[PDB]
Structure formats: structure tokens, C-alpha cells
Design a protein around this ligand. Structure first.
Ligand code: MG
Ligand code: MG
Ligand code: MG
Ligand code: MG
Ligand code: MG
Ligand code: MG
Ligand code: MG
Ligand code: MG
Lengths: 386, 386, 386, 386
């Protein structure tokens, strides 16, 4: 289970670079030079890295300081063959963003947030990013009166519309991905789930430019089924990027390494991504626990890719197993894929076998055979044949 | 706080009529005649009632039996002045629907579900309903392999598209509302939240015919902020109906009377509905606890309306209080409602005060004053002036 | 992975016998004769069965009817070699228990609940049960004022104390196990977690007679770590029985087959039970989903035992792997097992290396190496060596 | 609703002093001098303040630096009349505690944690504290293999036993309170709920010295009913201290001001505390949101006390209302307080009215009248009479 760049595994600089500061504790690890993280991740078999503007260029940096940081980073990318498929803006760390960026109540902050974002869009394009992610981690509220959500959604639309006008006017070949999170650090965050993000995108001026960047742990913080949500995003044609990690249920955002947390959900996710032929980066937005020294950082990062590759193998074996294919037919997964009424409405209405002569009791008595199928899935996941 | 039909309070027959059967217990109350519930609810000041087909017409009923049940019901509506603003289909109780209705794996069940739905759409129109609700309570799965969600969403779209073709071809003045629920009775239900439902509607052939029917407790079963979700639905122009009740957090669907559960959320919901001028029914989808006899049923139903009316008064006092209006300005709610960059993209880009000369530290130092505002909201809710 | 009676796998009659009635749906399966379930479970390799009084003897049965049901059941146990290690009382289904049994507000109901319980204790002893479980599923409240919890806990203590006086006076060799559940069917249930149950037991007159019967899914309905809670119960010497099933997070009680739900938690549970040498029944309190016909019932029941046995093998391989044993030392699990200050308080106080000369920065810099250990655990679970 | 020191409202230095650093953001407020917080809180009507050792004495401080910080603090207490009823140790911020203090795998860290705790116990006694709180925020794990919970509980017992031996040998009049939290910052924290803490205390050598310090938001992070848990703690005689704040459901620890979050739960809590005559400090462990400047800090702190006092008034009016007293009788709260079988076991067994002649159907038909009672409680909370 050795990854290669062909597997398109990507990591954020802020992931392996997380110093271990949490709400109750100081950093347990020194800062990592981005150049060092690029080199170490390349050695592990990663395909590329991603960055917030402020991960790469310290906030407040001069234009010449900015130039030197980018040059050194480019050199490490050239030395390693690592790509930068995705970039994003930090609109959450600095105190100015304490009430949000795009939907801050203060208008001057919203304009600043846009300008900070645009500056980094230009850098992302220069470094070759195809996807620009927006995680509005400070967009939201702790109290009901602080935020009129209709006005906030107007401001969010306005912001994304202006970004879309910017990238179009510049001729940039880059698309946007909205990353939902239900809460944390705000008490409730706007666009809290994949569904809310999808719905919002349809009200943008140029919806084709926007997709979602769902995160495993974020949807699971609302107790939702992450493979189900990814399926809906794929059905909508909007899965532009994906953030992979682990989460043990409804609690603070743990950002465990992928495969940790809900393992069965990870299996079904990989099954879906591979079956749908998702072609984008497999990006890990995770935090090596602050219990770990640097050797644990790289072990946790390695484990992300390892677990993906193990699950890929098991999901492929599951789908290729003739006993499973027969079980899917026994559970009528084939019938689910056929149209209900390709004969059309009038034919349905005139079809007495669909109502007047439908034997509901005989249909009710048919077992779905789902537990046999699910145990075959369990056996395959655990490598107990099937 | 006495309700009148002018308040547009509506109840489902299945609410006051719930016999108290839960997963671990038999009925504690005898069945209510729908005619009796209409009369009792009218006496309480309700505006109208809603029904599943199977609440009103026992499943398996003859066409003549069906006729007599409808005639008796119409008579009680004529005697009381009660309206029927909304109707829905029971696609969840009968065993034939154990794997769903519209997205059952068995194709013959899906066709039956459509025909059962269409039959009731005709009845709803005859009784004057404006909104036809669809709660796909059995659409979903307990296991990953049982349901290919992309195919299920194709089948769900197909079903709703066919219903839209039916109502258009019949010339019916009725709109559809999708009611999301994250789980229960299925392990995960498709279209689990308002956001997912909104996103799905945009992929229907005639999206204008479809809105959402969010339920307080359902969104709170995913830990989401119900007023936030309603705000998004209103912003999208899709709040066609609303189900009001109470829920104590992430657990089984409690269907407590409205005002119970998260009281502050109820306050902010009423504030929003009244401020947005929501004109639709205030419908209670609640269950009088099975601890109650019939006197408790009517007391709980009365309490639904009472709590709405109390919260309406408090929310109105909050918004009318000059000290609150000043506090909203102090927190820059006025600024949130102004466009970020009505001057347009190029002006924003050339505006040095938006980036190069923006004093981020002075903006960061500005307090939002949200806690003062929220305590004014608390004081108003509790009737401690403000 | 074929179970034998030596594995001590037990099932409740109500598990495979669940007819599929849920809050929103009728039964999908006919009733199973208890004699038939005993025979089918024996064929699957189960060790024994458990029962509520009302599973075995229909409520309201005559003494002669009661006699005939018990005789037929005994015959099937004699024919199959199946044991009855545990029995319990149904104090939740009948409407009389709608506000509880032992803590019902009505005193006459509480006395009835005790007498119904005692009658079944005598039957349990006659059938050879060693453990008598009490799941107070109706003990609790939906509203704050309905239940004074201090008085309810007095009534709960009184009930359990009287049962303990009964079994002592009769000379019965039977112990009690309290089964916690946080909610459902009551809005909040008293003694909601293993911890609450443990704490309560210490206030009983004869605490030695009482332990806990934790259920996987119940603790996970509060988002708690089930292996952690079992560890505390084992540390207290109070793990008298255990209910095994699966649960996908904080939602309604799903009672999925064991191994479903949180698979990693299942692995760590088995690891703990086997490492601690838990000798009691491995009892499955699960529901075959109502999507299943009888073949699915037996497949789901079989899967319970299969998954236990697979996880047992993986957990044993994990613990036996020299690379894992070295990793445990690297993470200082050995040091966790040594006393902190066996030298005693005064020696600790005088030990300058414990404070005045303790190099906190060098200790802070030591990595815990937990992520490497956890990936070895993952590799073992998935059968990817280690 | 003006508080006076007679109301025994206390605040942690770390509450109003929280600088606003969260997992995703820098501080938004400068550090507060503890002397300044004491003065400002006294002006607001607080009774006293509490502290972690490291809030008051910067970590690493010299003995003379330590002396000067304590002297300045004492002076502000003497100037203001403020008391210090409670103190605690910071065993969570410094990296050395990244795997815990009392249950760190490294033995030298556990000995250091004890010595750091003992040093502060001496200071707490000198400043007049009656309660010494222990919040083991780093005691726990993110992964199953990192922490053998039986050994960790041995180490936790050993630690608390040694502290109890220390305070006894010194003759200190101080008691210990364990503060449970289910998770955050560890993935799962040991002793996650009030129940677990209560159960653990009973295994200590001197259980009389230990109680619980439950926090509103912590129990609600497991979805539990906080008044229920407080009731159990009171029933056990173990409510030594209480931390008051607000929490919006199962998510990260929000530490909202008291009254925010679940308002009905706050009402029932106050009702219980006042009805039980809880005499201890009403301590607020809350964080003014990082959106606030210092004026918002004091407004949020003021709101804590205000909301307690409003709820106290409403709960008192509820209990004093003759209509409520009649409703409690109608719901048989009086009967709940009478013994079930003061006549004893043999009398119960011979009482045919308790089983053979008990009319279960007539008892089943009795309504509990809980919804009427709960609406009276709602009316009182909202000041709509009753
Ligand atoms: Mg995350
Ligand atoms: Mg992410
Ligand atoms: Mg509901
Ligand atoms: Mg509803
Ligand atoms: Mg269960
Ligand atoms: Mg159980
Ligand atoms: Mg807290
Ligand atoms: Mg606290």
C-alpha cells in the first residue's frame, strides 16, 4: 500500500504544519518551514500541497518579503515535482475577521476580505491551482440577533459573484469550491452542510464556476452520512474537491487522520469516489494530534494515504466479487437504476398493475436481503473473504 | 393570548390523533374520529387541519367507503369553518413501503407509490389544499450498499417530475413542499436537511412548483440552527409551508408541542417568520405525549398556539424597542444590509482604503456589542423589559 | 469464524422476534414462536436465549396458560441444549407503565411493577438465569416538572432494595444488572449512562448484588466512548452482563447487528473484553431491520456472532504482534501501569526531580507515538498485517 | 435584578480574562490584570473569584515573583471584599501535559502534576478557598490503544487518594470537586459525566472528601439533562460546587453566558438549586465571545448574574402559584414522594390489590396531566402569569 504521486494525494501546509495549539493548550511542536513540509511530503509519496495565503506568506509581509517566500516555495516545488492543485484564503485567524470576512457586519472588513482573497487568487493561478476553496469559518453567529441571515446570504452571494466576475475578467481557468462546516469556531456557521452550499450555489450569477469542497468530519459534526452527501454532490455535478479526515461523531472538529473515526463511512466513501471516477485531488485536511512529535506527524500523514489505499482495495474487491454482484441483484439495486415510469405519466395512470391490481401484500412480503449484503461488505472490509 | 382562525394555526389529524404507540409501547389512547378532531380544534381556535390520505381514508377502503369518509369530513369542515390548506401522502406506514416509496429498490412499489400519491393529490385539490407535502420518511438506508444514492436521487427526481407533470396537465393550483428529516425511521434519510432539499429542487424540471416544508425538530436532530435554515429557505423564495414543534436536541424525533424544546430558537423563529411576513399556515406537527389522556391532548394542542402567540408578542416588543434599534446599529446590523461593493469590482480593486491603507488593527479592535444585544433579546423574551 | 455454544453468544427472544413495528410503520414480519427461535438460534451456534416475561408469557395469561407456555419453552431448551443466562421484566410496553414502573408517579403502579418483577424473578431462577436485568425504559420524563428526580431516585432505590431483600430472603443465586439508556422512549431516562448507574448502585443497601448491563448503542446515543465506559465498569467490578449491537452515532436507538455502526469501537470493545477475561454472556440486543424477511433475520443474527469472532481474532493478533508490544512500550503504556508514587506522599514531596529539578521542556518534547500505534491497530483490524 | 455579594456569584479569572484565542484565531483582547478583574467584578456585584494557579502566577515564576503576584492579588481582595471560594490547577495548558497530568503515560509527568497541584492547594487554603476543583481536561485519548483505561483509573485514584492524604495530614478544611467533561480537548475524556465522576468517587479511600463540580455545558455536550444530573448529585450528597454557563447542544464547548443556550434547562436548574437549598457558590465558567471588546466582557458577565436572578424569580413564582401546586397534585408528584412499600416486602407480596386484583386498565387510563403542568411552567418562565 505504497502511495505514488499518481494517487493524487494532497496535504495542506497547515495540516502537517499544525503546531498543536488548541483552545486549552499551547503549541507542542515548533513551526515547520513550508519548504521542509513539501520535501517531506514528496518523500512520503504525496502528489501536492495546498495553502492558505497566510500559511505561505506571513501576515503583514512586505511585497519583497512576499516575493522571497514565494520564490523559495516554488524552488521546493520544482525540486520535488510537487503540485499545488488548490489554494484558499485565511479569512479566520486574524482578529479583524472575528465576525466574518465576506459576511462581517462591518462593511470595511468585507471589502478587505474580498481584496485579500483576490490577491491570493492571483497567486494561486501563478502556482497552477485549479480549485480555489472558500471556508467561511467565521461566517455565522453565536446569538440570534447578531446576524440577519438573509442579509448575510446577500453579502455572501455578492462576495462570490464578485470573485466570479474577477476570475472571468482575468481569464483565469480556476473554479471555486465552498467548504461547509456546521459550527466551530462560530456557534453556527452559514452554509452549514453540503446541501446548504449546493442550494446557495444555484443562486449565484455564474453557478457553473462554483462547487463544494466537503469535509468528512464536518458533515459528521451534524450527524449526517458523508457518503450520502458526496453522492448528492456528485449527482449535482458539483464535487470539485474533497477534504478527507476522520471524526468520532458529533463533537468538536477533530481532524483525525483519514480512516480514523468512522471507518465504515470511510469504506463507503472510497467505494463511491472510485466507482464514480472522481478525478480530483484526494486532499487530507487533518491535524496530527498534539501528542505527537515530528516523527508522529509523518506517521499520521503516511497513515492517511495508507488507509485510503487499503480501503480502495477492499471496495474494489467488494464490487468485483460475483457473490456481491448476485447479492446486489437480490436486493434489487439493479431495479433501483431503472426508470420508474419511462412509459410516461399517462401509461402509469392507465396501468392497473400499478394500483388497482397491485398485490401490495405480496410486494410487502419480499425481503430486501440487505443484511446479507451488508455482511458481505463487512467481510470484504475486514479481509475475511466474502 | 387567545388564538383565532386569523392566526392560521393548523394541525395534522395525526397529531392530536396520535394514539401513543412508540417503539416500545402500545397505544395509550383510543382512536379519534377525524370529525371529532376537526370540531375540537375549531373550538380551540385553529384555522384548519391537514391529513395524510390514510388518516382520513383507512387503507384498503372501498370507493364507496372512501366516499362516505370524505363526505363526513367535508360536513365537519362546513359545520366548523375549518380549512384544509395542506395534504400529504402516507408512504411510510404500510409494510410495502419498508424500503421507501419513490426510491424503493422495487420498481413496482415506486409505481404504486406514485399512483397512491396522485389519487390523494386529486382529493387534496377537491378539499381546497394549496400545498401538497412530501415527507420521504422511508427513503434512505440503514447500510451503505443497500441504496445507490445517485440512482435514488434519479428516482426521486423522476417521481417529483412526474407529479409536476400531473398537476400541470390537470391545471391544479397546488404546489409541492419537500419535508426534510435527517433520520428516523431510516438510519439515514435522503434529503436530510433543508439545504439538501433546496439543492435537489433546483434539479427538478419545474423548480418553481416545489418548495420546502421544514420542521423545527427535524433540523435540530442534526444539531442545526432552525432559524438559520428557515432564513435560507426564505432567501431562496422556497418557504412554502412550515411544521412547528419542539425538540430537545439530537435524539429521536420527539415532536413536542411548539415552544417546548429549544425556547430561544422558537423565539428567533417567530421573530423571523413575522419579520419576513411569512403568510402561510403555522402548522403544528407534534405529538401529545403518551402520558396524556384526551384532556392533555387538547391542553398540549392549545399550548402550541399559546406559545406562538406569546413569542410573537415578545419578538414584536424586541424589534419595536428603541434601545434594541440602537443596539442593532451599535452591532452594525445596518451595515450588514448595505452592499459590500455596489461601486463594483474595478472600484473595489482601486480602493486603497480597502487593502493597502486599511487599518486592520483599528477594525479588529472594534467590539461587535453582540452580548448586550443578546441580553436585550433575553430580557424581552422573559418579559423583564429591556 | 463459526460460533459454538462455547463462545457464550446469547440472544433475546425479542431480537430475532422483533416484528418490525417502529414509530412510523406496521409490522413487516409475523410473530415468531419462541420455540422456533430457540431451535433456529441453536442451529446458528448460539449458547442461549434471554426473555422478558411478556415475550414468553402473553400479558394477561392464565396460570394454566402460563404453565403451558413455560413447559413448551423448557422442552425446546431441553431439545437444543440452549441455556437461559439472563431474564428481565417488561415494564415498558403496557400503557399502565406510561410514566414508568419503579418510578411511576402513581404509587399503585409502582407496587404493581414490583410484583410483576418478582413473579418473573422466580421464573428466571427456575429456568437457570444468573443475571436479572432491569432496563427502566419508562423511568424519566419529557418535561421538567413531571418528575422530581430526587424523589424518583428514592423510589428507584426503594424498588431495587426490595428486590434485593426478596432474592436474599428466597436464597436465590441471582444478581441484578441495571441497563442504562440516555433517552428513548422517554425524553430523558433516569440513570442515563453506565456512570450514573454505577454511582446509583453504591447507594443501594446491598451494592454487591447489583452491576450494570451496558449496551453499545445506548452509550453511543450520548456520544460516549463505549470501551471507556466498559473499562470503568470492569474497574469497579460491576460488569455483570453486556448487550452488544451497533449504532451510528447520536440518533434513535438503532439496535443494528453487532459490528455495524462504529466498527473501531467494536474492535476496542472486543480487545478489552477478551483482555480483561470477561466471562459472561456475549448477548446481542439487536433488531434485524424491518426491510428483512426471515432469511434476513437469521443472516443478521449470524452476522452478530461472525463479527465478534472476526474482531476477536484481529484484537488477539494485535496484542500478540511483537511490533505492537514494542509500540506500546514506545508510547509508555508500561509506565501507565506503574504506580505514580508507591514511595508515598512524603517521598514525593521531598523528591526534587518531581518539581524543582524536573525538566518540563524535555518531558514536553517527548512524542507519545500514538499515531504509529493506532495505525498498527488499524492495519491489524483490516488484516493488512502490521 | 441587581446582584449583591449575598447571591454568591463567582467568576473565574480565566472567564472575563479570556483573550479570545480559539482553535482558528488569535486573541482579540489584551490580557486583563487579575487585580483589574477583581475590581471590575466587585463593581458588578460578584461575591468572589476563582483561579487556576497559572492564571494568577505566570508559569515559570520565581518564588519572589510568585510572592509579589499573590500580595497584589490579596490587596485587591482586601480592597474589594471579594472572596476566593474555589481554586484549581492548570494541568492542561503547558505542553508537558499533552497526554494528561494525573493519568499521563509518563510517570515523571504524573509526579510533576501532583506536586504542581499540591503547591496550589497550599495557596488556595491561604486565600480561604473551601473547594478545590480538578478538571482533568487532558486525561483521555484520541485513539483506543493509547490509554488503558483501567490503568488510567488506577492512576487517577492514586492521585486523588494522595491529595486526600495530603490535605488530611495538613489539617486543611478543604474538599475536592471533580469536574466532568465528555470530550475536548481530548477526543474522549476520562470520567466524562457527572455519573462517571460520582461512581469513581465511591472507590476513593476517603470518599467523603470528594464531590462533583458539574458544568451546564459539559453535560449538554453529551446530550444529557443537566438538572437531572444535578439532582442525582444532590441525592448523593456530592454537589460541592457548580459551574454555570450556556451551551447550544452537542458541539464544541461554547461556554456561553448563563441563560444562553438551553433556557428551559436553565430554569429547571435554578428551580432545583433553589428548592434543594444549594448553599454553595454560583460560579460562572463562561467565555465572553471573542467578538466583544471589554465593554462586552462586562456586559456578558453582568448577564450571567441577571439571568440567574430572573430565573430564580420565575421559578419561585412557579412553585408558589396555587394553580401549580394543584397541578402537581393532579400529576401525582405528591405520590412520587411517598414510599412505594413502607409496609415492607411481605405485605407487598400478600397485597392482592398490588397484582391479582390490580385493575391495570383503569390505572392505564389515568392521564398524567403533564402537558398542562408544563405549560404552566412555560407561562411562568415567560411572565405570562399562570
Ligand atoms: Mg475539520
Ligand atoms: Mg477542510
Ligand atoms: Mg418530527
Ligand atoms: Mg412534519
Ligand atoms: Mg438499544
Ligand atoms: Mg439492551
Ligand atoms: Mg466548558
Ligand atoms: Mg468549568
Amino acid at each position: 500500500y505504497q502511495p505514488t504521486p499518481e494517487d493524487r494525494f494532497t496535504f495542506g501546509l497547515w495540516t502537517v504544519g499544525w503546531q498543536g495549539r488548541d483552545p486549552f493548550g499551547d503549541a507542542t511542536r515548533r513551526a515547520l518551514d513550508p519548504v521542509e513540509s513539501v520535501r517531506r511530503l514528496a518523500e512520503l509519496g504525496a502528489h501536492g500541497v495546498t495553502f492558505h495565503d497566510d500559511d505561505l506568506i506571513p501576515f503583514g509581509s512586505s511585497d519583497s518579503e512576499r516575493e522571497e517566500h514565494v520564490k523559495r516555495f516554488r524552488q521546493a516545488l520544482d525540486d520535488t515535482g510537487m503540485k499545488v492543485p488548490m489554494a484558499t484564503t485565511n479569512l479566520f485567524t486574524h482578529p479583524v475577521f472575528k465576525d466574518g470576512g465576506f459576511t462581517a457586519n462591518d462593511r470595511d472588513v468585507r471589502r478587505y476580505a474580498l481584496r485579500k482573497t483576490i490577491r491570493n487568487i492571483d497567486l494561486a493561478v501563478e502556482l497552477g491551482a485549479e480549485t480555489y476553496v472558500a471556508w467561511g469559518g467565521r461566517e455565522g453567529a453565536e446569538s440570534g440577533g447578531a446576524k440577519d441571515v438573509r442579509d448575510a446570504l446577500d453579502r455572501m452571494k455578492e462576495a462570490f459573484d464578485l470573485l466570479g466576475e474577477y476570475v472571468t475578467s482575468q481569464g483565469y481557468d480556476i473554479r471555486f469550491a465552498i467548504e461547509p462546516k456546521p459550527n466551530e469556531p462560530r456557534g453556527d456557521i452559514l452554509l452549514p452542510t453540503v446541501g446548504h452550499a449546493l442550494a446557495f450555489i444555484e443562486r449565484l450569477e455564474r453557478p457553473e464556476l462554483y462547487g463544494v469542497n466537503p469535509e468528512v468530519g464536518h458533515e459528521q459534526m451534524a450527524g449526517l452520512n458523508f457518503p450520502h452527501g458526496i453522492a448528492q454532490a456528485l449527482w449535482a455535478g458539483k464535487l470539485f474537491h474533497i477534504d478527507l479526515n476522520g471524526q468520532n461523531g458529533i463533537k468538536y472538529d477533530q481532524d483525525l487522520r483519514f480512516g480514523a473515526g468512522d471507518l465504515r463511512a470511510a469504506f463507503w466513501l472510497v467505494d463511491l469516489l472510485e466507482s464514480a471516477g472522481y478525478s480530483g485531488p484526494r486532499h487530507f485536511d487533518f491535524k496530527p494530534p498534539r501528542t505527537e512529535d515530528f516523527d508522529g506527524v509523518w506517521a499520521s500523514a503516511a497513515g492517511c494515504m495508507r488507509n485510503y489505499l487499503i480501503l480502495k482495495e477492499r471496495a474494489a474487491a467488494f464490487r468485483a466479487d460475483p457473490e456481491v454482484q448476485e447479492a446486489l441483484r437480490a436486493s434489487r439495486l439493479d431495479e433501483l437504476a431503472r426508470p420508474t415510469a419511462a412509459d410516461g405519466l399517462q401509461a402509469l395512470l392507465d396501468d392497473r398493475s400499478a394500483f388497482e391490481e397491485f398485490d401490495v401484500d405480496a410486494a410487502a412480503a419480499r425481503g430486501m436481503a440487505f443484511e446479507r449484503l451488508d455482511q458481505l461488505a463487512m467481510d470484504h472490509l475486514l479481509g475475511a473473504r466474502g
